């Protein structure tokens, strides 16, 4: 099989500046017919891949001319001239000179933007969930930048790690931020043994955590 090699990640790219994505192929893709059969696909978050560039340097219909591509039979470069929020996603290179058809691993474009503090919201368990015997406490830490962030749960002032599960979104196509949910999963039995529930977000945008709480 032809191996298409591309790095997993790009150094974050400031909005409005240049991104460059490399690919190489273990076999020349330059055909006797003049064409280099190298293709680029973009997979935006939650989307299917779509064709970006074909035959090395040709833009697919609708693709913005901020996109361009160059290369030999074996080494290739995708350039986006002035990156926009919408361009985030995973960029895949592919050949079309034989079977099997193979793809590169994908290179994720990260956008760099201004630091943004998270907006924190905490939610007590629904009456419905409590009827079912469950008590999950949810905390959303929304639209922050950069990606790195910490959440701490407290029950009646004491730190709780047991039953905490965290999930991070991919970078937002619109504002280039990230969001994270932290869910504290309790049984109704344990939830009703305490009163005050707190989630605290620590992010580089302040030395003080953003603290949200409720009393049961």
């Amino acid at each position: 099989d032809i191996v298409m090699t591309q790095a997993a990640f790009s150094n974050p790219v400031t909005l409005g500046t240049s991104a460059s994505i490399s690919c190489r192929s273990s076999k020349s893709l330059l055909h006797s017919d003049g064409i280099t059969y190298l293709y680029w696909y973009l997979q935006k978050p939650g989307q299917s891949p779509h064709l970006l560039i074909y035959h090395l340097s040709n833009l697919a219909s609708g693709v913005p001319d901020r996109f361009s591509s160059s290369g030999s039979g074996t080494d290739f470069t995708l350039r986006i001239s002035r990156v926009e929020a919408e361009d985030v996603g995973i960029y895949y290179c592919a050949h079309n000179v034989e079977l099997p058809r193979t793809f590169g691993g994908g290179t994720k474009l990260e956008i760099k933007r201004a630091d943004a503090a998270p907006t924190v919201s905490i939610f007590p368990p629904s009456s419905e969930q409590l009827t079912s015997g469950g008590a999950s406490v949810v905390c959303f830490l929304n639209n922050f930048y950069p990606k790195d962030i910490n959440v701490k749960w407290k029950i009646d002032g004491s730190e709780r790690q047991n039953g905490v599960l965290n999930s991070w979104t991919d970078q937002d196509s619109k504002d280039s931020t990230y969001s994270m949910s932290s869910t504290l999963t309790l049984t109704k039995d344990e939830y009703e043994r305490h009163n005050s529930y707190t989630c605290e977000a620590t992010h580089k945008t302040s030395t003080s955590p953003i603290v949200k709480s409720f009393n049961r």
Partner: protein, 209 residues
């Protein structure tokens, strides 16, 4: 323009079988080559099978990892492609796309190969105890995926659904929506959750506590 739309995915036991298909519109189907490409976090994009045209005696090609297991076929009169997948293993779990080399992709259909059982989600409203943030907790389901929308898709901006987390062979996820304060509860906000594998469609109105 061209539309490629897969169906037939779901859950099956290791050793079992599945048959998926896609229908293509907006081009003359019989004139295009047809392939299936699967996507898993472990292997990325993986081409698995391709079928050529009636003039090629419907010639077929397979990835070495699935030869003998998978059978690709097409019904030009119905504009439909099929993949028959036998003796499935856990590693055959993935999103399967119809890929018309090299220009078109479908939206994928999810195939899970697992001995765990299908379980529908329980859906619970997240209400607070200038903008207001609401949510839906979708708990205790198997397999992936679920889809969450808000007001049947009307609320699209200010929404994000977080990746599902697996515990004890059940998934949980949440979705958050942020709207202006005046609008809710005055106007209704409802999360709509679908879990194709159990044929569950649920709507949960978010009401003030």
């Amino acid at each position: 323009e061209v539309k490629v739309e897969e169906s037939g995915g779901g859950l099956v036991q290791p050793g079992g079988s599945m048959k998926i298909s896609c229908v293509v519109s907006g081009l003359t189907f019989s004139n295009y080559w047809m392939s299936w490409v699967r996507q898993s976090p472990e292997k990325g994009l993986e081409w698995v099978a391709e079928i050529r045209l009636k003039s090629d005696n419907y010639a077929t090609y397979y990835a070495e990892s699935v030869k003998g297991k998978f059978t690709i076929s097409r019904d030009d009169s119905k504009s439909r492609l099929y993949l028959q997948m036998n003796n499935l293993r856990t590693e055959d779990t993935g999103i399967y796309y119809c890929f018309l080399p090299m220009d078109y992709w479908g939206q994928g259909t999810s195939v899970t190969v697992s001995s765990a059982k299908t379980t529908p989600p329980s859906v619970y409203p997240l209400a607070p105890g200038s903008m207001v943030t609401l949510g839906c907790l979708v708990k205790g389901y198997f397999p992936e995926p679920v889809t969450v929308t808000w007001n049947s898709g009307s609320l699209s901006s200010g929404v994000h659904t977080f990746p599902a987390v697996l515990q004890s062979d059940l998934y949980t996820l949440s979705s958050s929506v942020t709207v202006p304060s005046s609008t809710w509860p005055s106007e209704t906000v409802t999360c709509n959750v679908a879990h194709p594998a159990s044929s569950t469609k649920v709507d949960k109105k978010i009401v003030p506590r």
